[PDB]
Design a binder for this molecule. Structure first.
Ligand SMILES: Nc1ncnc2c1ncn2[C@@H]1O[C@H](COP(=O)(O)OP(=O)(O)OP(=O)(O)O)[C@@H](O)[C@H]1O
Length: 185
């Protein structure tokens, strides 16, 4: 029992990774299938925009998220080979080894070390259980994810904010894929 009355509606989309990685139709598919499995108030407008395009309802498979209030969210979304089912426990930290392993005799010989247990155990899991790193929202995480922002998308962005609407970006596997304009209903 809580509020959800300030409803958002998706109003314009533009692409940035054109010809290089992902196209507009796969962009709206991966955002709409991610928000089909999330619990957010805003990105679910793209869930409908996708569901109404696909004419199917049966969209969204497993997600491994990291969420923030106001600043957007990040996750790993599968469907392409999700038939393995992943181990996801604390995995953004879950370390193979907090020590040397490329050439120990040249770099800090503390120990004997493990060389197969836990090492590769998460990488070979993901490389068979094929998956996709995606994030969406705000503007500061769009900076912090190692990306570059251009003066034309910024002139397009602040303009929707000047018009008093909701103005956000979408990133994928350390690339910028595109941007979204949204309004209130
Ligand atoms: N699924 C989501 N994906 C990305 N960003 C999201 C998501 N849900 C919310 N946001 C972020 O929320 C920000 C807007 O915050 P705002 O305070 O307007 O929302 P709200 O908290 O729902 O509003 P209200 O003040 O009515 O509670 C956007 O810039 C957007 O990035």
């Amino acid at each position: 029992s809580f509020t959800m009355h300030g409803t958002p509606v998706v109003n314009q989309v533009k692409v940035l990774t054109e010809s290089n990685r992902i196209s507009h139709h796969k962009i709206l598919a991966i955002v709409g299938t991610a928000e089909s499995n999330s619990e957010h108030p805003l990105g679910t407008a793209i869930t409908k925009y996708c569901k109404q395009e696909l004419d199917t309802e049966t969209l969204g498979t497993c997600i491994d998220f990291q969420v923030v209030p106001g600043c957007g969210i990040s996750c790993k979304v599968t469907n392409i080979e999700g038939l393995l089912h992943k181990n996801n426990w604390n995995i953004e930290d879950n370390n193979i080894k907090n020590a040397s392993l490329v050439q120990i005799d040249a770099s800090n010989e503390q120990s004997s070390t493990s060389s197969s247990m836990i090492i590769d155990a998460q990488i070979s899991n993901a490389l068979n259980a094929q998956q996709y790193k995606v994030l969406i929202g705000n503007r500061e995480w769009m900076i912090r994810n190692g990306l570059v922002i251009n003066n034309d998308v910024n002139d397009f962005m602040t303009e929707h904010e000047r018009k008093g609407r909701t103005a956000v970006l979408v990133a994928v596997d350390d690339e910028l894929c595109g941007l979204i304009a949204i309004a209130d209903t």
